[PDB]
Amino acid sequence: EAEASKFVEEYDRTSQVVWNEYAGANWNYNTNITTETSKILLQKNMQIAQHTLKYGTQARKFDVNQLQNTTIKRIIKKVQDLERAALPAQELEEYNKILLDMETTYSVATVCHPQGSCLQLEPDLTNVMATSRKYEDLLWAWEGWRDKAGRAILQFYPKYVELINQAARLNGYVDAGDSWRSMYETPSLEQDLERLFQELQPLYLNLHAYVRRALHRHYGAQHINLEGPIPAHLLGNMWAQTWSNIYDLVVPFDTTEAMLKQGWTPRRMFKEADDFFTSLGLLPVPPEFWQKSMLEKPTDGREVVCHASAWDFYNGKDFRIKQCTTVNLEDLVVAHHEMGHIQYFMQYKDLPVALREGANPGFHEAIGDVLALSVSTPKHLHSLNLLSSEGGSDEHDINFLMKMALDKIAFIPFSYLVDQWRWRVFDGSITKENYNQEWWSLRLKYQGLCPPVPRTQGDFDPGAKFHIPSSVPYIRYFVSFIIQFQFHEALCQAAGHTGPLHKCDIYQSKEAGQRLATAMKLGFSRPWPEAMQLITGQPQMSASAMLSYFKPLLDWLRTENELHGEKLGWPQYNWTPNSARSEGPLP
Numbered sequence: 001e002a003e004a005s006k007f008v009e010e011y012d013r014t015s016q017v018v019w020n021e022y023a024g025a026n027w028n029y030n031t032n033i034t035t036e037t038s039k040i041l042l043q044k045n046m047q048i049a050q051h052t053l054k055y056g057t058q059a060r061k062f063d064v065n066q067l068q069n070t071t072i073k074r075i076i077k078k079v080q081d082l083e084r085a086a087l088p089a090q091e092l093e094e095y096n097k098i099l100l101d102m103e104t105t106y107s108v109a110t111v112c113h114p115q116g117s118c119l120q121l122e123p124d125l126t127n128v129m130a131t132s133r134k135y136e137d138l139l140w141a142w143e144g145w146r147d148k149a150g151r152a153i154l155q156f157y158p159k160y161v162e163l164i165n166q167a168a169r170l171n172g173y174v175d176a177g178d179s180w181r182s183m184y185e186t187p188s189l190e191q192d193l194e195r196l197f198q199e200l201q202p203l204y205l206n207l208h209a210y211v212r213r214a215l216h217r218h219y220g221a222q223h224i225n226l227e228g229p230i231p232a233h234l235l236g237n238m239w240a241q242t243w244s245n246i247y248d249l250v251v252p253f254d255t256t257e258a259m260l261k262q263g264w265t266p267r268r269m270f271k272e273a274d275d276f277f278t279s280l281g282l283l284p285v286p287p288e289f290w291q292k293s294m295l296e297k298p299t300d301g302r303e304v305v306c307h308a309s310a311w312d313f314y315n316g317k318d319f320r321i322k323q324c325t326t327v328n329l330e331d332l333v334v335a336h337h338e339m340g341h342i343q344y345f346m347q348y349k350d351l352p353v354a355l356r357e358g359a360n361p362g363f364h365e366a367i368g369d370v371l372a373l374s375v376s377t378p379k380h381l382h383s384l385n386l387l388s389s390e391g392g393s394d395e396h397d398i399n400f401l402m403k404m405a406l407d408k409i410a411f412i413p414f415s416y417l418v419d420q421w422r423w424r425v426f427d428g429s430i431t432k433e434n435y436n437q438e439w440w441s442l443r444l445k446y447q448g449l450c451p452p453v454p455r456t457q458g459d460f461d462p463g464a465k466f467h468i469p470s471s472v473p474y475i476r477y478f479v480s481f482i483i484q485f486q487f488h489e490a491l492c493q494a495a496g497h498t499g500p501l502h503k504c505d506i507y508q509s510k511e512a513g514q515r516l517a518t519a520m521k522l523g524f525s526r527p528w529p530e531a532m533q534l535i536t537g538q539p540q541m542s543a544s545a546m547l548s549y550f551k552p553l554l555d556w557l558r559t560e561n562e563l564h565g566e567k568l569g570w571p572q573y574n575w576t577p578n579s580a581r582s583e584g585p586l587p
C-alpha cells in the first residue's frame with residue numbers, strides 16, 4: 001500500500017512536466033497550423049506516449065481491488081488506461097498523423113464562389129446559415145461545406161476507426177465506444193440516456209411540428225411537407241443542431257447589433273463572463289490567461305483551429321481559451337461555456353493529476369452553460385443594455401421559452417444521435433460502405449430531418465462536423481443539456497428564487513457559487529452521483545428539471561399544434577416539390 005502511494009507521487013510529479021510540454025506543442029499547432037508546428041506536435045506525441053507507457057505498465061502491476069484507500073484506488077485505475085499509447089510505435093505514429101490530417105483538413109477547408117471569394121466556416125459560412133432566408137443560398141453553403149470538409153475526411157476515417165478500436169481493445173475495452181462510455185462509470189448508461197431522450201420526445205415533437213409549420217409559411221408549401229421531415233439547411237445552423245437563429249420566423253407573438261454598436265469586443269465578452277463568475281464568488285482568471293489566450297481569429301493570415309476550446313496546461317497557473325470569437329450573443333454564450341471549463345480547471349488544480357477531470361465529462365460541459373442560462377434571460381440582457389426592457393407578460397414568456405427551446409430542446413436529439421452513429425461505427429455495425437446512409441437514417445429517426453439534396457457516392461457528412469474528425473466524444477453534450485437544468489433548478493432554489501424557473505437569474509448569488517465550487521473541487525475523486533447529489537439533492541440524471549423549465553411552452557405548443565391539426569412526427573420521408581406545368585406554345 002505504501003508502494004502505491006509512492007507510485008502516485010512519482011506519477012503526479014513527472015506527468016506534470018510531460019503533459020505541460022505536450023499542451024504547449026498542441027497549442028502551437030492549434031494556433032498556427034504549419035508543417036513545422038505539425039512536426040513538433042507529432043514528435044511530442046511520441047514523448048508523452050513513452051511516459052504513459054512507463055507509468056501505465058507499472059500501474060497495471062498493482063491489484064487495485066486489494067487497495068484500502070479509495071482515492072489511491074481511483075487514481076491507479078485511471079493510470080492503467082494507456083489510451084493511444086497502447087499502440088505500437090509505428091501504429092501510434094500513423095494514428096497520430098491521421099488525427100492531425102483530419103483536424104487540419106477540417107480547419108482549413110473553404111467554400112469558394114466561382115471566380116469569387118472563398119468562405120471559411122467561421123465566421124463566413126456560420127453567418128450565412130444564421131442570417132440567410134433564401135433557400136438556394138442556404139443550400140449553397142450547406143452542400144458546399146459537406147463537399148469540401150466532409151468528402152475530404154472520408155479517406156482517413158476507416159483507418160482512424162481501425163486504430164482507435166485497437167488502442168481500446170489493448171486497454172481492455174471491446175471498442176473505442178466502449179472505452180468512451182466507460183468515462184461515466186455507469187453500467188446502465190445507454191438505457192439511462194434512452195429514457196432521458198424519451199422523456200423529452202413529446203416536447204421535441206411539438207417543437208418540430210410548430211417550427212415545420214413556420215417554415216411552411218416562409219419557404220412555401222412546395223418546399224415543406226407538413227407530414228414529413230424538415231430540410232436540414234433551414235434551421236439557422238450548419239448542422240441544424242440548434243435552431244435559435246430562425247427565431248424571427250417562428251416567434252409566436254437584435255442583440256448582435258446592440259453588442260457591436262455599444263463597443264463589445266471579444267475581450268469584453270470574456271470579461272463579462274469573468275465578472276459573472278466572480279459575482280458568484282468563484283475564481284477570476286489569472287492575468288496569464290489574458291496574456292496567452294487566442295480570443296480572436298488571427299489577422300496575419302495564420303491558419304488556426306477556430307473551433308472554441310479551453311486548455312489546461314497542467315501547472316496550476318496556465319489556463320487558456322482558443323476561440324475565433326465573433327461579436328454576437330451566440331458566441332457570448334460560447335465564451336461562457338469555455339469560461340466554465342477554465343473555472344473547473346482552476347477549482348481542481350490542486351488535486352492529484354489523474355483526478356483532475358469533471359465528475360463526468362458532462363459536468364465539465366455544463367458549468368458554463370448554467371451561468372449562460374441566467375445571462376440569456378430578458379432581465380439580464382436588458383441589464384447589459386443588449387435589450388430594451390420587456391414587460392413580463394404571458395406572450396413574452398412564451399417568446400422567451402421558444403427562443404431557449406430552439407437551442408436547448410432542438411439540440412437534444414442531435415447530441416444523442418452523434419455517438420449513436422459513432423458507437424455503431426466503432427462496434428462494427430456501420431462500415432464505410434454505409435457511413436453516410438446510417439448517418440441520415442439516424443438524422444431522420446431522431447431529429448426528423450432530411451437532406452435537401454441526394455447524397456452521392458463519396459459523401460461523408462459526419463466528417464463535416466468538427467467533433468468527428470477531431471475525435472471528441474459527443475454524448476457529453478447530451479448529458480450537459482439535461483443536467484445544466486438540474487443545476488439551474490438547484491442553484492435557483494438555493495439563491496431563494498421562487499416562481500417560474502425560466503425567470504431565475506443567479507447573478508450575484510454567493511450561495512450558488514459556493515455550491516458549484518465544492519462540487520468542482522471534487523474533480524474525479526468521487527463517482528459522479530455524489531457530485532450530482534451535493535448540487536441537486538438527488539443522485540440521478542433527470543429530465544424533470546428541463547421539463548419543468550419548459551412546462552409553459554409544452555402546454556402552449558400542444559394546444560397550438562392540436563388546434564392546427566398538426567401530425568406530430570414525420571411518417572412521409574419520400575416526398576418532393578411539385579414540378580410546375582410547362583405549357584406551350586414552345587419557341
Ligand SMILES: *[C@@H]1O[C@H](CO[C@@H]2O[C@@H](C)[C@@H](O)[C@@H](O)[C@@H]2O)[C@@H](O[C@@H]2O[C@H](CO)[C@@H](O[C@@H]3O[C@H](CO[C@H]4O[C@H](CO)[C@@H](O)[C@H](O)[C@@H]4O[C@@H]4O[C@H](CO)[C@@H](O)[C@H](O)[C@H]4NC(C)=O)[C@@H](O)[C@H](O[C@H]4O[C@H](CO)[C@@H](O)[C@H](O)[C@@H]4O[C@@H]4O[C@H](CO)[C@@H](O)[C@H](O)[C@H]4NC(C)=O)[C@@H]3O)[C@H](O)[C@H]2NC(C)=O)[C@H](O)[C@H]1NC(C)=O
Pocket residue numbers: 008069070071072348350351352521522525
Ligand atoms: C485516502 O487518501 C486520501 C488522499 O490523500 C492525499 O492524496 C494522496 C494522493 C497523497 O498525496 C496524500 O499525501 C494526500 O494527503 C486522503 O484524503 C485527504 O484527507 C485529508 C484528511 O481528511 C484531507 O485533509 C483535510 O482537507 C480539508 C479540505 O482542505 C482541502 O480542500 C480545500 C477546499 O475544499 C482547500 O482550500 C485546502 O487548501 C485543501 O486543499 C487540499 O490541499 C492538499 C494539500 O496540498 C491537496 O493534496 C489536495 O489536493 C487539496 N484539495 C483541493 C480540493 O484543493 C481541510 O478542511 C482539512 O483541514 C481542516 O480540518 C483540520 C482539522 O481536521 C484543521 O486543522 C484545518 O485548519 C481545517 O479546519 C477547517 O478550516 C476551514 C477553513 O479554514 C474552516 O471553515 C473549518 O471550520 C475548519 N474546521 C475545523 C474543525 O477546524 C484537512 O486539511 C485532504 O484534503 C484529503 N486529500 C484529498 C486529495 O482528498 C484520505 O484521508 C485517505 N483515506 C484514509 C481512510 O486514509
Ligand SMILES: *[C@@H]1O[C@H](CO)[C@@H](O[C@@H]2O[C@H](CO)[C@@H](O[C@@H]3O[C@H](CO)[C@@H](O)[C@H](O)[C@@H]3O)[C@H](O)[C@H]2NC(C)=O)[C@H](O)[C@H]1NC(C)=O
Pocket residue numbers: 032034036037302
Ligand atoms: C507560425 O509558424 C511558423 C513556422 O513554424 C513561424 O515562422 C518562423 O518564424 C521564425 C521567427 O520569425 C523564423 O525564424 C528565423 O529568424 C532568424 C533571425 O532571428 C532568420 O535568420 C531566419 O531566416 C528566420 O527568419 C522562421 O524562419 C519562420 N519559419 C517560416 C517557415 O517562415 C511563425 O513565426 C509562426 N507564427 C506565429 C507564432 O505567429
Ligand SMILES: [Cl-]
Pocket residue numbers: 239461462
Ligand atoms: Cl449533416
Ligand SMILES: [Cl-]
Pocket residue numbers: 180183361362473474475476
Ligand atoms: Cl463523453
Ligand SMILES: [Zn+2]
Pocket residue numbers: 337341364365
Ligand atoms: Zn465544452
